[PDB]
Amino acid sequence: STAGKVIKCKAAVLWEEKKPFSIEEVEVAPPKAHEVRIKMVATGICRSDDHVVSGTAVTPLPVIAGHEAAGIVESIGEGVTTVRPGDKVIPLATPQCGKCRVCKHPEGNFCLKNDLSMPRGTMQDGTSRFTCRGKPIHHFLGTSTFSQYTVVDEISVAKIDAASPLEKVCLIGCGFSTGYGSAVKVAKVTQGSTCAVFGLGGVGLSVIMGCKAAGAARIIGVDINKDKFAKAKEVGATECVNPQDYKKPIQEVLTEMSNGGVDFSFEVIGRLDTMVTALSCCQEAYGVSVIVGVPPDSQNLSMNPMLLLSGRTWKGAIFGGFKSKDSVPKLVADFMAKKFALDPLITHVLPFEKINEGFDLLRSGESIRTILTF
Amino acid sequence: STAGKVIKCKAAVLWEEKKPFSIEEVEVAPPKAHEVRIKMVATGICRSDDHVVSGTAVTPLPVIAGHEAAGIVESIGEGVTTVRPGDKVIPLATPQCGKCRVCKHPEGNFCLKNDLSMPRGTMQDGTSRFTCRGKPIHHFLGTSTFSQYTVVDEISVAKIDAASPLEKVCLIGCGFSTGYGSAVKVAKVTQGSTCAVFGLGGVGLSVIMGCKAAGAARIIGVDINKDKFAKAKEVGATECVNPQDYKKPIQEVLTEMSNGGVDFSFEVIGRLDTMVTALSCCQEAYGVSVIVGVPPDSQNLSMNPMLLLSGRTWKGAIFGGFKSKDSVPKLVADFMAKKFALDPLITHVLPFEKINEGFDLLRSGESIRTILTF
Ligand SMILES: NC(=O)C1=CN([C@@H]2O[C@H](COP(=O)(O)OP(=O)(O)OC[C@H]3O[C@@H](n4cnc5c(N)ncnc54)[C@H](O)[C@@H]3O)[C@@H](O)[C@H]2O)C=CC1
Ligand SMILES: NC(=O)C1=CN([C@@H]2O[C@H](COP(=O)(O)OP(=O)(O)OC[C@H]3O[C@@H](n4cnc5c(N)ncnc54)[C@H](O)[C@@H]3O)[C@@H](O)[C@H]2O)C=CC1
Ligand SMILES: O=CNC1CCCCC1
Numbered sequence: 001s002t003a004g005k006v007i008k009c010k011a012a013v014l015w016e017e018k019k020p021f022s023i024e025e026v027e028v029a030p031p032k033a034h035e036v037r038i039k040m041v042a043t044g045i046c047r048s049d050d051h052v053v054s055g056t057a058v059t060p061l062p063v064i065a066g067h068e069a070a071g072i073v074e075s076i077g078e079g080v081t082t083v084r085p086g087d088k089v090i091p092l093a094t095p096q097c098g099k100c101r102v103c104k105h106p107e108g109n110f111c112l113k114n115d116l117s118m119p120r121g122t123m124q125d126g127t128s129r130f131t132c133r134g135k136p137i138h139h140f141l142g143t144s145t146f147s148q149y150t151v152v153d154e155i156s157v158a159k160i161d162a163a164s165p166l167e168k169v170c171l172i173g174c175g176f177s178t179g180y181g182s183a184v185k186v187a188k189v190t191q192g193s194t195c196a197v198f199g200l201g202g203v204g205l206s207v208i209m210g211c212k213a214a215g216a217a218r219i220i221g222v223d224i225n226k227d228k229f230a231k232a233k234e235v236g237a238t239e240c241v242n243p244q245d246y247k248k249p250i251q252e253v254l255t256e257m258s259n260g261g262v263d264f265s266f267e268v269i270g271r272l273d274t275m276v277t278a279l280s281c282c283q284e285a286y287g288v289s290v291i292v293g294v295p296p297d298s299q300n301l302s303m304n305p306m307l308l309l310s311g312r313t314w315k316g317a318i319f320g321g322f323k324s325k326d327s328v329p330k331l332v333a334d335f336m337a338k339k340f341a342l343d344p345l346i347t348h349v350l351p352f353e354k355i356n357e358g359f360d361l362l363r364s365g366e367s368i369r370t371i372l373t374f
Numbered sequence: 375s376t377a378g379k380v381i382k383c384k385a386a387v388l389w390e391e392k393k394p395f396s397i398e399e400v401e402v403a404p405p406k407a408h409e410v411r412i413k414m415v416a417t418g419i420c421r422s423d424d425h426v427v428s429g430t431a432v433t434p435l436p437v438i439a440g441h442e443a444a445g446i447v448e449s450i451g452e453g454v455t456t457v458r459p460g461d462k463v464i465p466l467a468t469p470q471c472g473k474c475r476v477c478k479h480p481e482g483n484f485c486l487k488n489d490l491s492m493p494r495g496t497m498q499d500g501t502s503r504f505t506c507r508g509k510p511i512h513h514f515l516g517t518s519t520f521s522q523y524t525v526v527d528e529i530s531v532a533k534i535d536a537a538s539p540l541e542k543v544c545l546i547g548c549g550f551s552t553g554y555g556s557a558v559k560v561a562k563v564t565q566g567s568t569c570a571v572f573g574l575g576g577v578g579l580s581v582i583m584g585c586k587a588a589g590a591a592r593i594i595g596v597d598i599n600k601d602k603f604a605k606a607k608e609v610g611a612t613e614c615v616n617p618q619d620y621k622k623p624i625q626e627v628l629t630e631m632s633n634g635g636v637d638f639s640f641e642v643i644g645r646l647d648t649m650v651t652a653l654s655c656c657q658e659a660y661g662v663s664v665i666v667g668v669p670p671d672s673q674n675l676s677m678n679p680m681l682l683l684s685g686r687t688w689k690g691a692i693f694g695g696f697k698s699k700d701s702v703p704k705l706v707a708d709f710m711a712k713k714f715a716l717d718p719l720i721t722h723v724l725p726f727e728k729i730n731e732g733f734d735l736l737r738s739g740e741s742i743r744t745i746l747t748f
């Protein structure tokens with residue numbers, strides 16, 4: 001019915017920063033060589049999407065944001081070999097070209113074809129497939145899932161099991177895999193260790209799930225919103241602390257609580273001051289701290305390098321360290337085999353047309369993940 | 375003859391910052407329980423000793439500095455079981471109490487009994503064994519080797535092979551083990567990798583030795599003193615670069631040479647701006663950078679956390695990550711089996727009485743290690 005022809009559908013267009021999303025009709029071009037056009041089934045609201053609205057993350061505007069999603073292939077361009085029409089797929093905000101030095105490295109996953117380091121907001125070929133009111137619209141991280149239809153490059157999409165529940169496994173496209181892998185793969189949390197998780201949203205709850213799966217004995221959740229603590233304990237936190245309850249800096253509180261520092265800390269908020277605090281609260285001689293949260297654009301933190309000279313390890317990761325096209329299908333298969341749970345992250349399910357209500361839920365602190373359904 | 379008695383001997387006392395050492399008579403008390411009095415045989419001049427003179431590293435003054443050394447036990451206090459009179463020994467600037475959480479951890483080595491985090495300039499019991507002109511003199515890192523005799527706590531000394539050449543193996547007390555271990559143990563340099571070493575003094579040359587021992591394919595030495603390059607190449611550097619030779623910043627220069635960034639980088643100078651440069655020059659997705667150099671006291675560096683979010687790992691270490699009392703004797707044994715070489719590090723030999731000439735050689739850039747003989 002639509003193969004090869006332009007599709008008119010609705011999408012949520014962000015024309016300016018700090019504005020509501022504009023739900024209107026867009027035109028989606030057919031896929032070119034090695035491109036895939038996807039009909040969306042579900043998309044999650046990740047804080048990184050809100051970072052585009054707030055100016056925390058800079059990407060060319062106007063844009064169709066959205067990147068944590070799942071859908072069904074509508075058509076494929078010339079040369080595509082990894083997916084076919086009717087396939088269930090998850091778009092990959094971090095691609096896996098399989099040919100760059102990073103793709104070939106055994107540990108690396110930040111493929112050099114990403115659109116994060118130098119945001120261009122296009123397809124790999126430098127152009128856009130979206131038009132709205134006659135204007136070209138930018139892509140976001142080579143995904144753009146806030147639309148009934150999107151076009152992605154083949155290296156930015158993974159085929160998943162045909163029996164997958166797409167309204168749950170869309171979280172494997174970002175939030176869950178980021179937090180879970182940050183714990184089990186990047187930090188490599190050890191059994192019986194003490195962990196501190198700063199930020200108890202969708203990604204931080206997934207960090208806790210990973211720390212628990214790795215066998216940590218203590219998991220301390222840190223959040224200034226005490227309404228987050230109940231769910232954090234349900235997924236594995238042993239204790240929760242609110243920094244605003246203390247006179248003392250929270251790094252000093254965590255050090256005392258852990259009898260000299262935690263084994264692993266995670267910053268899953270996106271604040272410079274909490275990145276330094278999370279590093280300081282891990283044990284000075286053998287602690288490991290992982291940055292997951294995204295800081296405001298172009299801002300530098302300040303820290304004393306003696307925190308590292310004593311023995312600490314500080315690292316960060318995109319997408320939990322997972323090689324995206326390899327790992328996403330295996331994570332879906334693991335989910336299906338009930339190896340982990342996604343329902344604790346899903347607090348709200350709304351129709352796509354209520355996208356703005358979903359972001360209001362996030363900004364107000366009331367939601368973890370809202371899933372938008374098409 | 376001297377057991378149980380105060381020993382009057384000559385030491386290099388630092389009365390004030392930024393002044394020459396004063397070679398003069400001190401009184402060295404006999405060792406108390408679990409203390410060891412050592413007759414010094416040789417001590418190296420490490421940049422960290424000069425950091426005490428310049429105020430870069432703060433420890434209470436007046437002080438007997440020196441920490442990279444080897445000697446012979448003169449007497450032991452009550453309860454000492456690990457060393458006896460006449461034993462050859464190396465003092466440990468980082469102790470190994472064997473009982474704290476760090477000593478019990480498999481990776482950690484920054485024993486909580488250290489005198490670095492919160493310098494007191496005393497023995498473990500809070501007192502001093504040194505008197506000069508009737509005044510108490512501080513210790514340095516629980517070692518104080520710029521003296522014909524010193525007293526150290528049992529956890530700060532290791533017995534070594536009775537046939538050891540003390541005028542060479544004193545370097546295993548700091549410089550060599552720090553650089554070598556930073557490469558083979560902290561970074562865990564892999565075979566065929568590309569390394570960048572910032573700073574080609576005694577410790578940076580030892581990092582190069584460790585990178586070569588690990589099988590690195592390329593080892594890029596970085597120094598603003600081009601006179602350091604010849605020796606760096608002799609011990610394993612494949613290329614040397616002087617940042618002052620380029621119209622662009624050296625991290626860009628190293629990123630171009632490594633076709634996208636190095637596998638392992640090492641800061642072995644002690645400058646805030648080169649710590650950030652060394653981190654920036656590794657692969658953004660899988661590179662590892664190790665801080666070895668000592669920053670000026672209490673100064674903060676400034677960096678963009680996106681350097682870590684992409685996947686980099688940043689860490690630091692004291693003494694190359696080696697558990698000091700376990701490792702020093704083994705390193706001496708390996709040296710005697712010619713598993714590594716120390717002669718390339720020793721450029722100057724002076725009598726202890728010419729200590730100020732030895733520091734002039736270091737400050738002028740002419741020496742790597744000057745060994746002082748008592
Ligand atoms: N590295 C990566 O690959 C990815 C990174 N992210 C980033 O991770 C971060 C978290 O994402 P979500 O979980 O979706 O966000 P979220 O907004 O749902 O969670 C943030 C949590 O931090 C808490 N918080 C805010 N300020 C705080 C403070 N000063 N102290 C303690 N807690 C504080 C909030 O109460 C909230 O619960 C965001 O910055 C996002 O951009 C998200 C996905 C992938
Ligand atoms: N972590 C630890 O356990 C230890 C740390 N250290 C520290 O390591 C550092 C090096 O010690 P040494 O090798 O003994 O010192 P060193 O002074 O002999 O070597 C430093 C080298 O850095 C070079 N350099 C200076 N400024 C530079 C710049 N802007 N760019 C490039 N190169 C520059 C100098 O030309 C010199 O060759 C010192 O800061 C020392 O305190 C030393 C021993 C143990
Ligand atoms: O949330 C998905 N991706 C993120 C990764 C970190 C930078 C902002 C975008």
Ligand SMILES: O=CNC1CCCCC1
Nearest residue numbers: 420422431467548668692
């Ligand atoms: O050089 C020996 N020890 C050093 C270790 C890093 C801080 C200054 C002292």
Ligand SMILES: [Zn+2]
Nearest residue numbers: 046048174175
């Ligand atoms: Zn996301």
Ligand SMILES: [Zn+2]
Nearest residue numbers: 097100103111
């Ligand atoms: Zn790639």
Ligand SMILES: [Zn+2]
Nearest residue numbers: 471474477485
């Ligand atoms: Zn100890």
Ligand SMILES: [Zn+2]
Nearest residue numbers: 420422548549
């Ligand atoms: Zn030293």
